[PDB]
C-alpha cells in the first residue's frame, strides 16, 4: 500500500551501506511512520534519517534523504552515504531547494 522509488545514485550505492534485509526492515519502518526522518530546515520538506544506529548511535551511521508524496503513498529515496563523508547545504542551496519544492507542491 506504499511505494519506494530509488534514485540512480541510491541504487548505485545502497548495497555498500545497507544490507538487503536492513533495507526491507527500513522500508517497513518508513511505511509505518512517513515522518520518521527529521525535516531539513528551509528545504521545502526533504527529510533526513540516520538508519545505521541501534539507538542514539550518532557517530556511526548511514544516512538517507527522502521525500514523501502524500498522493500515491510514494517515497522518493534520493541519496545514501557514510555519516561524515558529505558537505552541508548552504543557505543559497536551501533557498533553491525550497523554491523547487514549492513549485512541485504548486503544480499538484
Amino acid at each position: 500500500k506504499s511505494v519506494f522509488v530509488e534514485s540512480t545514485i541510491f541504487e548505485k550505492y545502497r548495497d555498500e551501506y545497507l544490507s538487503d534485509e536492513e533495507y526491507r526492515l527500513f522500508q517497513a519502518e518508513l511505511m509505518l511512520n512517513p515522518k520518521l526522518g527529521d525535516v531539513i530546515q528551509g528545504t521545502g520538506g526533504l527529510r533526513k534519517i540516520r538508519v545505521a544506529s541501534k539507538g542514539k548511535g550518532k557517530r556511526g551511521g548511514s544516512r538517507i534523504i527522502y521525500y514523501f508524496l502524500d498522493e500515491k503513498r510514494r517515497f522518493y529515496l534520493l541519496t545514501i552515504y557514510g555519516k561524515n563523508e558529505m558537505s552541508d547545504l548552504n543557505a543559497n542551496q536551501r533557498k533553491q531547494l525550497m523554491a523547487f519544492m514549492e513549485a512541485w507542491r504548486n503544480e499538484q
Binding site: S2, E6, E85, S87, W104
Partner: protein, 103 residues
C-alpha cells in the same frame, strides 16, 4: 569528500520530477500493509501434519505447553495473537522451527 551533496541531491530531485511526470523509469519496490492474522484449529493441525510431527514434539520445538496446543487444536481456546503469528511464521518458513528450538 569524494562526493558533493548538492550534485547528488539535484540529480535525484530532477529524476524525481521526471518520474512524477511519467517520462522516466526508475527501480521501484512496493511493500504491502500489515495484516490481521487469524488461524482456525484445522489450520493448526494441518501445519503440524505438514511436519509429520506428533503434538508433543511440535509443542516442545515451539516452546509451548502441549496441553495448550491441545486446547488450540480441539478448539477449546483461541490462540493468543503471538501464537498465531508464530504458527504462521513456521507455516510460511518451516526452517524457522529449527531456529526457534535453537534459542
Amino acid at each position: 569528500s569524494n562526493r558533493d551533496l548538492f550534485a547528488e541531491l539535484s540529480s535525484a530531485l530532477v529524476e524525481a520530477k521526471q518520474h512524477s511526470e511519467g517520462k522516466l523509469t526508475l527501480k521501484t519496490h512496493h511493500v504491502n500493509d500489515v495484516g490481521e492474522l487469524n488461524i482456525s484449529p484445522d489450520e493448526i493441525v494441518s501445519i503440524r501434519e505438514q511436519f509429520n510431527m506428533s503434538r508433543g514434539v511440535f509443542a516442545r520445538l515451539l516452546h509451548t505447553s502441549s496441553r495448550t496446543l491441545e486446547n488450540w487444536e480441539q478448539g477449546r481456546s483461541v490462540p493468543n495473537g503471538q501464537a498465531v503469528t508464530l504458527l504462521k511464521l513456521v507455516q510460511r518458513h518451516p526452517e524457522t522451527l529449527s531456529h526457534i528450538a535453537e534459542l
